[PDB]
DNA sequence: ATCAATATCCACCTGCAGATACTACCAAAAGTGTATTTGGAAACTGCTCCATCAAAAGGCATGTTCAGCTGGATTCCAGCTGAACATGCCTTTTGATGGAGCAGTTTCCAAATACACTTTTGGTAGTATCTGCAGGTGGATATTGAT
DNA sequence: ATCAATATCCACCTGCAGATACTACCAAAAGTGTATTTGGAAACTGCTCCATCAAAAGGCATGTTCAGCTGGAATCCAGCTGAACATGCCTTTTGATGGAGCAGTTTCCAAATACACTTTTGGTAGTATCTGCAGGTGGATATTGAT
């Protein structure tokens, strides 16, 4: 019998680490902290996006719900930078295919 | 007269709030301190309320906007919908 | 001599009066002015439902009254009966609203 | 040949996975195609921000490997990350050195 | 045709509770018993508050429950006060309470 | 126009059971409505997480029950569970 | 066989352990009565978290309390914990 | 002749030491026994993943350290350097843990 | 002790805002019945990891002594803050009156879901070899406290 | 100030736990393409209710005076609590073993969803009558503070 797969953000967290600090490593416990962080923020944003949609009688969560959720959830400068990165990623995504 | 709007929250009104809070004696510096705290509270709630207004593409801040804002700030309010 | 209640006597009378009642204690129009002014900094040319402003004053007054309770306990902790700025600051810090 | 939605979006974080997690999470009846793109990018950005500051804390401590202590230093020394994670406990993170002034000797 | 509420012995609307669960995006599927159980819980909690609030009204020589009475009932009840510890009752005011050290003589 | 659902008529129904000679102001009815909506959301929310945690796609009376236990203080929980079990039994036997 | 009866293990939270925790919390001087007060506060905290954790365990029809049981319990009480599978 | 540091010198040394490190400060086996004792009173025949016990200890110690911080501020507020039961109680009251 | 200035309470009264009882209208909601589908319990069982044991040992808990300096008590008085009162400024009221814009309705298309099929990938497993740093040592520098 | 006792620093080192590497493998995940469905943006409009305006009226904010009593400073001292020490217990560490019970696989049906159809109900809108209680009264008496 095979133990079923346990997904995590580790390889993606690790990629970002090498971008910002090419010669810096990360312990497995620290990576455990980072994985909890990403899961936590995911749920917080998704949760707020969910409520936002429901409040406005919409059945679809779009990038617009995510954006408003990010503004509600994140403090000043973090929200500003998150919004620009999110907006950039979406426009670039649609500009292709 | 040309007074700031936050200054419209008067010493006697703040006194009354303190009295309901069970306060018997009040330092002269409390009133300015209270106004600053009050403003931060309002800024935080109104910011979120307006963010709900904007998302709904409205120009009118509704009670539900405020109720939703208060809830996510951990100040759940009964009596105005929701 | 004319009549004078001792300092503290009327204060206690007021505490009993306002703890008995439920009416809002900030004047409506000045509060409405404050709200519109703050909201203008986030988005211009807004309108408010009347109930939106009322919900804001109910929440705001309930918050300050509760804060004044904690503040009062902080003053009494330091063996005072007079609340001070440092009492409010301590209460807010332990509440996690600051620092 | 097939390009991943991440590469198409210019992202390191997985767009396909984020889309799947949104659908399985019972957040809404429908999920727009832009939603997981925007969300993955935000998560990736916040990850970058914490790792930048944590690597710096590691460096300040003459270490090349980030441990939970460095994550905690980075978060609690940054006002906005501290607010965002104000109700979060970092295991083996400890606390910031901080002695109240009145406790020092004269 | 007989309502699920009457079938379950409840005043609270089982059908509406079920529809609310389905449209609330809580889960893919909702079992038959779930809205019945939930409706019953909400009705009971409602009864408990109205009981204590009604009592508060009588104590104040009133026959009509107002927000003040709901607040008195909730804050004077240990478990309800805990359940609603982070909730504000509009026009509820506070409990009469003066710290002993502030009393004269 | 349109219609706005609330728990008003059901709250009023329950009021007459517990206090036949007692009325309720509209403002107080508003607070009761807020109350029912709030507790609904809390219980449904917790039940949702419970199902998700256990990789189930169905919220059953069992999830509502565990949610009730997690959310309500001691005695309130005991009686709520009792009332909930009572209504599911009576509904089944019909 | 069954293990020895468990009792009075709150006293295992010793005076020096409590002093150490207070030091990390920046405390310089400690009253003699603090130690019993801290044990009581700790017991309440542990009881509350364990109660919720076991409630999750039972709902899953398990006999073993998992780290996730504890994590979920900490979360719903607003003591979110990173590092154990969040 | 034998050397003695003044009262408070070593206490300050200890604050600097433990604020610098991250290791758990409660002994492991006694804490596990407390967890098993408390759990057993809620439900018999429970087993624990070892990581479940550790998650409980990390959470418990983080809570107490944070509580001692607030407690310290309450003592200092009363112009004391010594924390007392009433400092803890005031902190927990304002936190809303016993309000 | 008395005595006077106010506050506070109780009984009663009455206008009206807001609660009630009425009929009537209707779309959405709820029930009912049939056909289809599938989530998850039951059974079986592989295999992780939890409980328990042993056995050595030193890190650390316990209990004690001693006295530094802290907390608590007392006293004092400068001045801040409460009480009272005279002004008059502006909130409150309400009733009418445009009109902004919320919200309801219809249209229709970009973007959603559903599905079949093909490719890709991240997770696990298995071993096998680097490597950052914990922890130990010794010796120079720094801090503290007595004099 | 000098100096001695002790903590703190930093360089240097080595063992190794844990991080890294690589190949194999594969179910699930992910993407591509096609057909089909539809959420909600857009334009237009009706009607709710929001903003503003005038217009008194008096309630309530403000400024001033006076001093009661509170906060904070200063002084004393009893004894709590920190620092250091001796003693030895029990936590920690290491390793092993049985087997509980978590978890993976497959089978199978009670209960779920999905429509279509029918019946009921809650929300509503006028319309009219009703009534709980706020607010005002007088007069009894309780509280407060001066003697
Ligand atoms: Mn026991
Ligand atoms: Mn199946
Ligand atoms: Mn011993
Ligand atoms: Mn002495
Ligand atoms: Mn002192
Ligand atoms: Mn218009
Ligand atoms: Mn691969
Ligand atoms: Mn080292
Ligand atoms: Mn449509
Ligand atoms: Mn004087
Ligand atoms: Mn004093
Ligand atoms: Mn078995
Ligand atoms: Mn009807
Ligand atoms: Mn009256």
Residue numbers in the entry:
A (entry chain D): 29 to 125
B (entry chain B): 21 to 102
C (entry chain A), H (entry chain E): 37 to 135
D (entry chain C): 13 to 118
E (entry chain G): 14 to 118
F (entry chain H): 31 to 124
G (entry chain F): 17 to 102
Task: Give verbatim excerpts from the published study on this entry.
In addition, although the crystal structures of unmodified NCPs are known, we prepared the unmodified NCP by a similar method, and crystallized it in order to compare the structures between the H4-tetra-acetylated and unmodified NCPs in detail, under controlled experimental conditions for sample preparation and crystallization. We overexpressed the unmodified H4 protein in E. coli, and used it for the subsequent crystal structure analysis. The crystal structures of the H4-tetra-acetylated and unmodified NCPs were refined at 2.4 Å  and 2.2 Å resolutions, respectively, by molecular replacement as described in the Materials and Methods. Overall, the two NCP structures were nearly identical, as demonstrated by superimposition. In the H4-tetra-acetylated NCP structure, the electron density corresponding to the residues from S1 to K20 of H4 (molecule B) is missing, which is quite consistent with the previous structural analysis. The main chains from V21 to I26 and the side chains from R23 to I26 are visible in one of the H4 molecules (molecule B) of the H4-tetra-acetylated NCP. In the unmodified NCP, these features are almost completely the same: residues S1–K20 are disordered, and residues V21–I26 are visible in the molecule-B H4. As for the other H4 molecule (molecule F), residues S1–A15 and S1–K16 are disordered and residues K16ac–I26 and R17–I26 are visible in the H4-tetra-acetylated and unmodified NCPs, respectively. In particular, the position of R23 in molecule F and its hydrogen bonds to E56 of H2A and E110 of H2B, in the acidic patch of the neighboring NCP, are conserved between the H4-tetra-acetylated and unmodified NCPs. The averaged B-factors from the three independently refined structures of the H4-tetra-acetylated and unmodified NCPs were plotted along the nucleotide sequence.
The nucleosome core particle (NCP) is formed by wrapping the histone octamer, comprising two copies of the four core histones H2A, H2B, H3 and H4, with the superhelices of a 145–147 bp DNA duplex. The core regions of the four core histones adopt histone folds, which mainly contribute to the formation of the histone octamer structure. In contrast, the N-terminal tails of the core histones, which are rich in positively-charged lysine and arginine residues, protrude through the DNA superhelices. Furthermore, the N-terminal tail of H4 is crucial for the compact folding into chromatin fibers.
